Amino acid sequence: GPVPSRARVYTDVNTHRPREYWDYESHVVEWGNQDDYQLVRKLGRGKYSEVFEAINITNNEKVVVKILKPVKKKKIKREIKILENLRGGPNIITLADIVKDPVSRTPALVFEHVNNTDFKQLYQTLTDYDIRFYMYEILKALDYCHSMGIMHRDVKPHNVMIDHEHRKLRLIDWGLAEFYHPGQEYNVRVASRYFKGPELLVDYQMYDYSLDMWSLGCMLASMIFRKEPFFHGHDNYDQLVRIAKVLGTEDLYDYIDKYNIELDPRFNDILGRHSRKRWERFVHSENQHLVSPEALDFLDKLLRYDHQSRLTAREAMEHPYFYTVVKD
Ligand SMILES: COc1ccc(/N=C2/NC(=O)/C(=C/c3ccc(OC)c(O)c3)S2)cc1
């Protein structure tokens, strides 16, 4: 069978914290008053919720209200517990309140408001310095939640709110996040297609925080190469082919061989043979101002098949890529 795997860092965080830290099924929600918040406009509708701009009339404060669609109470308490465990963390969205929505019959989460510009406009104008700056700010958030025993599992541009005027970043949408427990087998149906790690795409369930580092690598490649998304698969199978055409098939086989994993035989007719490419081939006159040797080396150390070989968030913050970023 498959070879087990554990994270190389923060392995035992949850087994040394009290059961109440991670046993989200037993969490008792503390309810606020739903009448404190007036909905202003709908911002978005997802698979599991709808998001609204709102105002706290007992505050005059702008907030964001996320009203949950029905899903098993386990996953609602999971997201609530995770947001409360992480509240106050560097660049973590702050959960201000929780209420019962009378119409939906489901909880509604109240968040701090971030005056963000959508990434499709923002990524068109981010400079080399901006990308390094915001990548460092994301790394602060990930190392924090990783150090707190939590993996986000849905890192993507949509889940990174940026108020570019105030240089403020928040990592949002913790609805897929989960507590890391060594040896635990997790659902591989997480993250968006373009940001799924190879571990998900080969159905290896004993993954860890390093999944988020793959997703971050995918974001980085889209930004510095100005190709969003970078690995643009048509489905989950073609997604791994897209990755293999860049990272090569020999290291893909080394990866699945290390973990005693087999590919789905439907890859037989589609995967092919590919050498590993030099990242410089994606450089051209329209993105070269975003690319440096340090950028390519950093990206190369995030986008590894072997989840055990990717930089940790901590190690990533040590990379020369960030030497130019002013640290507060
Ligand atoms: C496109 O449909 C959806 C549906 C649900 C979503 N899920 C969230 N999960 C969070 O935590 C969110 C927090 C948030 C969003 C925007 C903000 O400012 C504009 C802000 O301050 C906080 S959104 C996202 C998009």
PDB file of C-alpha atoms in Angstrom, residues 14-232:
ATOM      1  CA  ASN A  14      -2.413  19.677  17.923  1.00  0.00           C
ATOM      2  CA  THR A  15      -1.520  16.663  20.058  1.00  0.00           C
ATOM      3  CA  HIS A  16       0.139  18.998  22.581  1.00  0.00           C
ATOM      4  CA  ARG A  17      -2.717  21.472  22.681  1.00  0.00           C
ATOM      5  CA  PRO A  18      -5.869  20.643  24.650  1.00  0.00           C
ATOM      6  CA  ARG A  19      -8.550  18.605  22.904  1.00  0.00           C
ATOM      7  CA  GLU A  20     -10.804  21.679  22.984  1.00  0.00           C
ATOM      8  CA  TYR A  21      -8.383  23.462  20.624  1.00  0.00           C
ATOM      9  CA  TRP A  22      -8.945  21.050  17.721  1.00  0.00           C
ATOM     10  CA  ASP A  23     -12.095  19.034  18.628  1.00  0.00           C
ATOM     11  CA  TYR A  24     -14.336  21.389  16.676  1.00  0.00           C
ATOM     12  CA  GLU A  25     -17.322  19.015  16.775  1.00  0.00           C
ATOM     13  CA  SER A  26     -17.706  19.841  20.479  1.00  0.00           C
ATOM     14  CA  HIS A  27     -17.395  23.612  20.008  1.00  0.00           C
ATOM     15  CA  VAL A  28     -20.302  25.657  21.377  1.00  0.00           C
ATOM     16  CA  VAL A  29     -21.006  28.738  19.284  1.00  0.00           C
ATOM     17  CA  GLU A  30     -21.495  32.026  21.104  1.00  0.00           C
ATOM     18  CA  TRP A  31     -24.204  33.893  19.205  1.00  0.00           C
ATOM     19  CA  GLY A  32     -24.352  37.636  18.678  1.00  0.00           C
ATOM     20  CA  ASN A  33     -27.426  39.656  17.707  1.00  0.00           C
ATOM     21  CA  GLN A  34     -28.303  39.459  14.018  1.00  0.00           C
ATOM     22  CA  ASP A  35     -30.187  42.785  14.280  1.00  0.00           C
ATOM     23  CA  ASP A  36     -26.858  44.640  14.645  1.00  0.00           C
ATOM     24  CA  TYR A  37     -26.026  44.257  10.917  1.00  0.00           C
ATOM     25  CA  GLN A  38     -27.813  45.722   7.880  1.00  0.00           C
ATOM     26  CA  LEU A  39     -27.003  44.188   4.496  1.00  0.00           C
ATOM     27  CA  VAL A  40     -25.953  46.771   1.894  1.00  0.00           C
ATOM     28  CA  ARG A  41     -25.176  44.737  -1.234  1.00  0.00           C
ATOM     29  CA  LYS A  42     -24.294  41.228  -2.340  1.00  0.00           C
ATOM     30  CA  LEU A  43     -20.616  40.822  -3.220  1.00  0.00           C
ATOM     31  CA  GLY A  44     -20.584  37.196  -4.303  1.00  0.00           C
ATOM     32  CA  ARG A  45     -22.227  33.779  -4.316  1.00  0.00           C
ATOM     33  CA  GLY A  46     -20.146  30.656  -3.818  1.00  0.00           C
ATOM     34  CA  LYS A  47     -20.852  26.966  -3.614  1.00  0.00           C
ATOM     35  CA  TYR A  48     -21.318  27.054   0.170  1.00  0.00           C
ATOM     36  CA  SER A  49     -22.332  30.646   1.048  1.00  0.00           C
ATOM     37  CA  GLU A  50     -23.241  34.151  -0.122  1.00  0.00           C
ATOM     38  CA  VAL A  51     -21.182  37.213   0.883  1.00  0.00           C
ATOM     39  CA  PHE A  52     -22.539  40.681   1.585  1.00  0.00           C
ATOM     40  CA  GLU A  53     -21.224  44.103   2.378  1.00  0.00           C
ATOM     41  CA  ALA A  54     -22.957  45.332   5.519  1.00  0.00           C
ATOM     42  CA  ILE A  55     -22.913  47.949   8.278  1.00  0.00           C
ATOM     43  CA  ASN A  56     -22.885  47.396  12.042  1.00  0.00           C
ATOM     44  CA  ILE A  57     -25.433  49.985  13.219  1.00  0.00           C
ATOM     45  CA  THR A  58     -24.218  49.595  16.832  1.00  0.00           C
ATOM     46  CA  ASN A  59     -20.785  50.630  15.495  1.00  0.00           C
ATOM     47  CA  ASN A  60     -21.273  52.603  12.260  1.00  0.00           C
ATOM     48  CA  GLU A  61     -18.617  50.122  11.093  1.00  0.00           C
ATOM     49  CA  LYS A  62     -18.455  48.505   7.648  1.00  0.00           C
ATOM     50  CA  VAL A  63     -18.319  44.714   7.839  1.00  0.00           C
ATOM     51  CA  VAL A  64     -18.608  41.673   5.589  1.00  0.00           C
ATOM     52  CA  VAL A  65     -21.358  39.126   6.282  1.00  0.00           C
ATOM     53  CA  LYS A  66     -21.014  35.586   4.948  1.00  0.00           C
ATOM     54  CA  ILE A  67     -24.297  33.646   5.119  1.00  0.00           C
ATOM     55  CA  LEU A  68     -23.790  29.883   4.956  1.00  0.00           C
ATOM     56  CA  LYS A  69     -25.751  27.539   2.769  1.00  0.00           C
ATOM     57  CA  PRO A  70     -26.716  24.287   4.538  1.00  0.00           C
ATOM     58  CA  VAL A  71     -23.811  21.904   5.132  1.00  0.00           C
ATOM     59  CA  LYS A  72     -23.138  19.395   7.882  1.00  0.00           C
ATOM     60  CA  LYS A  73     -22.719  21.135  11.247  1.00  0.00           C
ATOM     61  CA  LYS A  74     -19.237  19.597  11.486  1.00  0.00           C
ATOM     62  CA  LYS A  75     -17.852  21.858   8.763  1.00  0.00           C
ATOM     63  CA  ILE A  76     -19.561  25.009  10.068  1.00  0.00           C
ATOM     64  CA  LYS A  77     -18.062  24.531  13.535  1.00  0.00           C
ATOM     65  CA  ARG A  78     -14.755  23.672  11.861  1.00  0.00           C
ATOM     66  CA  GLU A  79     -14.552  27.054  10.144  1.00  0.00           C
ATOM     67  CA  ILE A  80     -15.741  28.927  13.242  1.00  0.00           C
ATOM     68  CA  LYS A  81     -13.247  27.227  15.552  1.00  0.00           C
ATOM     69  CA  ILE A  82     -10.410  27.803  13.096  1.00  0.00           C
ATOM     70  CA  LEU A  83     -11.214  31.516  12.701  1.00  0.00           C
ATOM     71  CA  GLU A  84     -11.386  31.947  16.490  1.00  0.00           C
ATOM     72  CA  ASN A  85      -8.151  30.007  17.056  1.00  0.00           C
ATOM     73  CA  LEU A  86      -6.365  32.229  14.497  1.00  0.00           C
ATOM     74  CA  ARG A  87      -7.960  35.588  15.365  1.00  0.00           C
ATOM     75  CA  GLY A  88      -5.308  38.257  15.836  1.00  0.00           C
ATOM     76  CA  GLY A  89      -2.789  36.381  13.682  1.00  0.00           C
ATOM     77  CA  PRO A  90      -0.707  38.245  11.090  1.00  0.00           C
ATOM     78  CA  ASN A  91      -2.879  38.985   8.046  1.00  0.00           C
ATOM     79  CA  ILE A  92      -5.638  36.530   9.069  1.00  0.00           C
ATOM     80  CA  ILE A  93      -9.172  37.809   8.394  1.00  0.00           C
ATOM     81  CA  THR A  94     -10.739  38.778  11.734  1.00  0.00           C
ATOM     82  CA  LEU A  95     -14.081  37.105  12.565  1.00  0.00           C
ATOM     83  CA  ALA A  96     -15.960  39.837  14.428  1.00  0.00           C
ATOM     84  CA  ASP A  97     -19.232  38.058  15.200  1.00  0.00           C
ATOM     85  CA  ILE A  98     -21.503  35.090  14.510  1.00  0.00           C
ATOM     86  CA  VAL A  99     -25.297  35.299  14.203  1.00  0.00           C
ATOM     87  CA  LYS A 100     -28.323  33.229  13.273  1.00  0.00           C
ATOM     88  CA  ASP A 101     -29.713  34.442   9.980  1.00  0.00           C
ATOM     89  CA  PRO A 102     -33.528  34.292  10.227  1.00  0.00           C
ATOM     90  CA  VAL A 103     -34.162  33.679   6.511  1.00  0.00           C
ATOM     91  CA  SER A 104     -31.546  31.050   5.723  1.00  0.00           C
ATOM     92  CA  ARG A 105     -31.868  29.251   9.096  1.00  0.00           C
ATOM     93  CA  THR A 106     -28.043  28.978   9.059  1.00  0.00           C
ATOM     94  CA  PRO A 107     -25.168  30.858  10.728  1.00  0.00           C
ATOM     95  CA  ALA A 108     -23.855  34.122   9.297  1.00  0.00           C
ATOM     96  CA  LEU A 109     -20.223  35.101   9.874  1.00  0.00           C
ATOM     97  CA  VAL A 110     -19.358  38.769  10.331  1.00  0.00           C
ATOM     98  CA  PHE A 111     -15.869  39.781   9.217  1.00  0.00           C
ATOM     99  CA  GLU A 112     -13.810  42.927   9.243  1.00  0.00           C
ATOM    100  CA  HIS A 113     -14.132  44.752   5.948  1.00  0.00           C
ATOM    101  CA  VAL A 114     -11.208  45.050   3.528  1.00  0.00           C
ATOM    102  CA  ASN A 115     -11.492  47.651   0.748  1.00  0.00           C
ATOM    103  CA  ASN A 116      -9.983  45.411  -1.919  1.00  0.00           C
ATOM    104  CA  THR A 117      -9.480  45.711  -5.662  1.00  0.00           C
ATOM    105  CA  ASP A 118     -10.231  42.510  -7.551  1.00  0.00           C
ATOM    106  CA  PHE A 119      -7.079  40.623  -8.417  1.00  0.00           C
ATOM    107  CA  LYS A 120      -7.715  40.681 -12.179  1.00  0.00           C
ATOM    108  CA  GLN A 121      -7.199  44.456 -12.090  1.00  0.00           C
ATOM    109  CA  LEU A 122      -4.564  44.381  -9.348  1.00  0.00           C
ATOM    110  CA  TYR A 123      -2.322  41.692 -10.833  1.00  0.00           C
ATOM    111  CA  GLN A 124      -2.124  43.741 -14.027  1.00  0.00           C
ATOM    112  CA  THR A 125      -0.395  46.596 -12.159  1.00  0.00           C
ATOM    113  CA  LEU A 126       1.593  44.933  -9.352  1.00  0.00           C
ATOM    114  CA  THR A 127       5.282  45.749  -9.675  1.00  0.00           C
ATOM    115  CA  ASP A 128       8.225  43.479  -8.907  1.00  0.00           C
ATOM    116  CA  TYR A 129       8.498  45.124  -5.481  1.00  0.00           C
ATOM    117  CA  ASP A 130       4.729  44.788  -4.840  1.00  0.00           C
ATOM    118  CA  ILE A 131       4.771  41.063  -5.635  1.00  0.00           C
ATOM    119  CA  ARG A 132       7.672  40.464  -3.253  1.00  0.00           C
ATOM    120  CA  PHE A 133       5.936  42.581  -0.582  1.00  0.00           C
ATOM    121  CA  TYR A 134       2.588  40.823  -0.785  1.00  0.00           C
ATOM    122  CA  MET A 135       4.145  37.373  -1.101  1.00  0.00           C
ATOM    123  CA  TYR A 136       5.934  38.033   2.190  1.00  0.00           C
ATOM    124  CA  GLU A 137       2.675  39.146   3.802  1.00  0.00           C
ATOM    125  CA  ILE A 138       0.949  35.948   2.631  1.00  0.00           C
ATOM    126  CA  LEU A 139       3.849  33.881   3.997  1.00  0.00           C
ATOM    127  CA  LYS A 140       3.365  35.520   7.399  1.00  0.00           C
ATOM    128  CA  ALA A 141      -0.255  34.359   7.422  1.00  0.00           C
ATOM    129  CA  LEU A 142       0.565  30.810   6.306  1.00  0.00           C
ATOM    130  CA  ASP A 143       3.422  30.295   8.742  1.00  0.00           C
ATOM    131  CA  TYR A 144       1.066  31.524  11.462  1.00  0.00           C
ATOM    132  CA  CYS A 145      -1.788  29.159  10.663  1.00  0.00           C
ATOM    133  CA  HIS A 146       0.662  26.301  10.030  1.00  0.00           C
ATOM    134  CA  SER A 147       2.295  27.006  13.397  1.00  0.00           C
ATOM    135  CA  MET A 148      -1.200  26.830  14.897  1.00  0.00           C
ATOM    136  CA  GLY A 149      -1.800  23.350  13.446  1.00  0.00           C
ATOM    137  CA  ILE A 150      -4.037  24.446  10.576  1.00  0.00           C
ATOM    138  CA  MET A 151      -3.776  24.127   6.810  1.00  0.00           C
ATOM    139  CA  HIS A 152      -5.796  26.520   4.647  1.00  0.00           C
ATOM    140  CA  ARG A 153      -6.232  24.218   1.601  1.00  0.00           C
ATOM    141  CA  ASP A 154      -7.718  26.912  -0.643  1.00  0.00           C
ATOM    142  CA  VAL A 155      -4.896  29.330  -1.369  1.00  0.00           C
ATOM    143  CA  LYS A 156      -5.679  31.228  -4.581  1.00  0.00           C
ATOM    144  CA  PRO A 157      -5.825  34.886  -5.658  1.00  0.00           C
ATOM    145  CA  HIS A 158      -9.561  35.163  -4.862  1.00  0.00           C
ATOM    146  CA  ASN A 159      -8.858  34.284  -1.216  1.00  0.00           C
ATOM    147  CA  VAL A 160      -6.207  36.992  -0.772  1.00  0.00           C
ATOM    148  CA  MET A 161      -7.889  40.348  -0.120  1.00  0.00           C
ATOM    149  CA  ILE A 162      -5.636  43.336  -0.787  1.00  0.00           C
ATOM    150  CA  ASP A 163      -6.335  46.972   0.074  1.00  0.00           C
ATOM    151  CA  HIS A 164      -3.538  48.292  -2.113  1.00  0.00           C
ATOM    152  CA  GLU A 165      -4.000  51.885  -0.896  1.00  0.00           C
ATOM    153  CA  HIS A 166      -3.039  50.937   2.670  1.00  0.00           C
ATOM    154  CA  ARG A 167      -0.844  47.985   1.618  1.00  0.00           C
ATOM    155  CA  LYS A 168      -3.108  45.740   3.710  1.00  0.00           C
ATOM    156  CA  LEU A 169      -3.532  42.043   2.983  1.00  0.00           C
ATOM    157  CA  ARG A 170      -5.874  39.484   4.528  1.00  0.00           C
ATOM    158  CA  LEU A 171      -6.131  35.743   3.876  1.00  0.00           C
ATOM    159  CA  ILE A 172      -9.859  34.924   3.792  1.00  0.00           C
ATOM    160  CA  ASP A 173     -12.209  31.948   3.184  1.00  0.00           C
ATOM    161  CA  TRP A 174     -11.238  29.391   5.816  1.00  0.00           C
ATOM    162  CA  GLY A 175     -14.199  27.145   4.894  1.00  0.00           C
ATOM    163  CA  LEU A 176     -11.922  24.415   3.517  1.00  0.00           C
ATOM    164  CA  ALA A 177      -9.334  24.747   6.296  1.00  0.00           C
ATOM    165  CA  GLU A 178      -8.563  21.784   8.523  1.00  0.00           C
ATOM    166  CA  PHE A 179      -6.541  20.809  11.577  1.00  0.00           C
ATOM    167  CA  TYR A 180      -3.368  18.849  10.777  1.00  0.00           C
ATOM    168  CA  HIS A 181      -3.008  15.552  12.666  1.00  0.00           C
ATOM    169  CA  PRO A 182      -0.051  13.321  11.706  1.00  0.00           C
ATOM    170  CA  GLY A 183      -1.201  10.200   9.911  1.00  0.00           C
ATOM    171  CA  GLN A 184      -4.676  11.559   9.147  1.00  0.00           C
ATOM    172  CA  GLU A 185      -6.078  10.867   5.686  1.00  0.00           C
ATOM    173  CA  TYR A 186      -7.769  13.955   4.249  1.00  0.00           C
ATOM    174  CA  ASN A 187     -10.244  14.617   1.468  1.00  0.00           C
ATOM    175  CA  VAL A 188      -8.383  15.336  -1.769  1.00  0.00           C
ATOM    176  CA  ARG A 189     -11.331  17.312  -3.216  1.00  0.00           C
ATOM    177  CA  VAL A 190      -9.999  20.641  -1.942  1.00  0.00           C
ATOM    178  CA  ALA A 191      -8.484  23.777  -3.494  1.00  0.00           C
ATOM    179  CA  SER A 192      -9.354  25.153  -6.921  1.00  0.00           C
ATOM    180  CA  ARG A 193      -8.281  23.134  -9.966  1.00  0.00           C
ATOM    181  CA  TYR A 194      -5.417  25.444 -10.997  1.00  0.00           C
ATOM    182  CA  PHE A 195      -3.925  25.452  -7.467  1.00  0.00           C
ATOM    183  CA  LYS A 196      -4.278  21.766  -6.537  1.00  0.00           C
ATOM    184  CA  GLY A 197      -1.046  20.129  -5.460  1.00  0.00           C
ATOM    185  CA  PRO A 198       0.272  16.975  -7.125  1.00  0.00           C
ATOM    186  CA  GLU A 199      -0.619  15.083  -3.932  1.00  0.00           C
ATOM    187  CA  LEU A 200      -4.301  15.847  -4.586  1.00  0.00           C
ATOM    188  CA  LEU A 201      -4.040  15.024  -8.285  1.00  0.00           C
ATOM    189  CA  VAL A 202      -2.617  11.547  -7.623  1.00  0.00           C
ATOM    190  CA  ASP A 203      -5.105  10.908  -4.780  1.00  0.00           C
ATOM    191  CA  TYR A 204      -2.512  10.851  -1.954  1.00  0.00           C
ATOM    192  CA  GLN A 205      -4.571  11.604   1.120  1.00  0.00           C
ATOM    193  CA  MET A 206      -1.933  11.877   3.866  1.00  0.00           C
ATOM    194  CA  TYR A 207      -0.914  15.418   2.932  1.00  0.00           C
ATOM    195  CA  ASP A 208      -0.115  18.390   5.169  1.00  0.00           C
ATOM    196  CA  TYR A 209       0.653  22.132   5.292  1.00  0.00           C
ATOM    197  CA  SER A 210       2.974  21.815   2.272  1.00  0.00           C
ATOM    198  CA  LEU A 211      -0.150  21.732   0.047  1.00  0.00           C
ATOM    199  CA  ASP A 212      -0.579  25.474   0.665  1.00  0.00           C
ATOM    200  CA  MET A 213       3.024  26.075  -0.451  1.00  0.00           C
ATOM    201  CA  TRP A 214       2.288  24.453  -3.828  1.00  0.00           C
ATOM    202  CA  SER A 215      -0.772  26.694  -4.203  1.00  0.00           C
ATOM    203  CA  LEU A 216       1.325  29.718  -3.300  1.00  0.00           C
ATOM    204  CA  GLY A 217       3.896  28.685  -5.901  1.00  0.00           C
ATOM    205  CA  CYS A 218       1.117  28.583  -8.488  1.00  0.00           C
ATOM    206  CA  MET A 219       0.042  32.113  -7.575  1.00  0.00           C
ATOM    207  CA  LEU A 220       3.651  33.310  -7.756  1.00  0.00           C
ATOM    208  CA  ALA A 221       4.203  31.816 -11.212  1.00  0.00           C
ATOM    209  CA  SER A 222       1.045  33.546 -12.499  1.00  0.00           C
ATOM    210  CA  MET A 223       2.214  36.903 -11.136  1.00  0.00           C
ATOM    211  CA  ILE A 224       5.855  36.999 -12.236  1.00  0.00           C
ATOM    212  CA  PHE A 225       5.154  35.367 -15.619  1.00  0.00           C
ATOM    213  CA  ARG A 226       1.879  37.279 -16.195  1.00  0.00           C
ATOM    214  CA  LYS A 227      -0.045  34.106 -17.040  1.00  0.00           C
ATOM    215  CA  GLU A 228      -3.111  33.667 -14.819  1.00  0.00           C
ATOM    216  CA  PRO A 229      -3.597  30.865 -14.074  1.00  0.00           C
ATOM    217  CA  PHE A 230      -0.173  29.359 -14.785  1.00  0.00           C
ATOM    218  CA  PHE A 231      -1.079  25.637 -14.959  1.00  0.00           C
ATOM    219  CA  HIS A 232      -4.324  25.953 -16.925  1.00  0.00           C
TER     220      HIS A 232
END
